[PDB]
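Q: Given only this backbone (279 positions), what sequence would you predict?
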């Protein structure tokens, strides 16, 4: 069992709180921001809406297009390794590699956050941008980006150069999926999409409707692949939709045609010029 309290991470303060009502339920917060929720022994139980959305969009794609018995999923970030733990249970032959910045969060995840052994879930303590730059061709089938959840994504995870590294690492036709937090101008999400469209042939999104409506900050799941995404009037899209209506916040699947209009006019981002200073 986890022990409730405050833990000093390498890059963050980590707080573990036991659910009052759920046996073996645990909330994990990072720098005061709720970041994951788990129920021990129930690796498919998710409480974070955007995690449910990633699960729905990624499973629809994997089920339609990929071979689960040999699936390789790279998680660039991911609070408590919970998404990795989820996919490891849904796809019991999958190999999930989580690249985590914080050595102490990595250690707590292995000890207390109820993950299966490596290679089903394998943690690498490293800078995720640097790991992406070293991807070799066709070395993974899915990449899930979930860095610093709750914050606007660091710029180096949003550029054409980053997406090009991800594209090289993906098996032909593989899936890129990102959690993007944005406030209601949506300039961040739209610029990420603009960069993704230079790199991947196809894009789709799963969106929080009150954020699209400018009511609040929210999450949008950005998907890119050289494989076509389902169209809005398909039976697969209806199945995705029924799942998206099952959470506490009903969400919407938007197909490539919608995304190209949504992000029209947005400018892709590029890595900044080098600002390295030498002694």
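A: Predicted residues:
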């Amino acid at each position: 069992t986890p022990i409730a309290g405050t833990y000093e991470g390498e890059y963050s303060v980590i707080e573990l709180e036991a659910d009052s009502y759920t046996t073996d339920g645990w909330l994990i917060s990072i720098n005061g921001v709720p970041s994951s929720h788990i129920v021990l022994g129930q690796p498919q139980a998710l409480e974070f809406e955007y995690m449910r959305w990633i699960a729905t969009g990624a499973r629809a794609f994997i089920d339609a297009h990929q071979d689960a018995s040999k699936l390789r999923i790279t998680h660039l970030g991911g609070g408590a390794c919970t998404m990795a733990r989820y996919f490891a249970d849904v796809y019991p032959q999958s190999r999930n590699t989580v690249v985590e910045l914080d050595a102490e969060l990595a250690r707590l995840s292995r000890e207390w956050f109820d993950i299966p052994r490596a290679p089903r879930v394998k943690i690498r303590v490293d800078d995720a941008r640097m790991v992406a730059e070293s991807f070799t061709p066709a070395s993974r089938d899915v990449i899930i980006r979930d860095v610093f959840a709750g914050a606007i994504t660091p710029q180096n995870f949003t550029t054409v150069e980053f997406f090009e590294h991800c594209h090289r690492g993906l098996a032909p036709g593989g899936l890129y999926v990102a959690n993007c937090g944005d406030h209601s101008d949506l300039r961040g999400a739209k610029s990420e999409l603009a960069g993704m469209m230079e790199v991947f042939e196809h894009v789709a999104v799963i969106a929080d409707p009150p954020m699209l409506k400018g009511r609040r900050y929210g999450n949008i799941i950005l998907m890119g692949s050289d494989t076509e995404f389902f169209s809005s009037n398909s039976t697969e899209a209806s199945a995705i939709t029924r799942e998206l209506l099952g959470g506490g916040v009903p969400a919407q699947y938007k197909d490539e045609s919608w995304v190209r209009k949504f992000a029209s006019g947005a400018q892709a981002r590029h890595d900044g010029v080098s600002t390295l200073q030498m002694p």
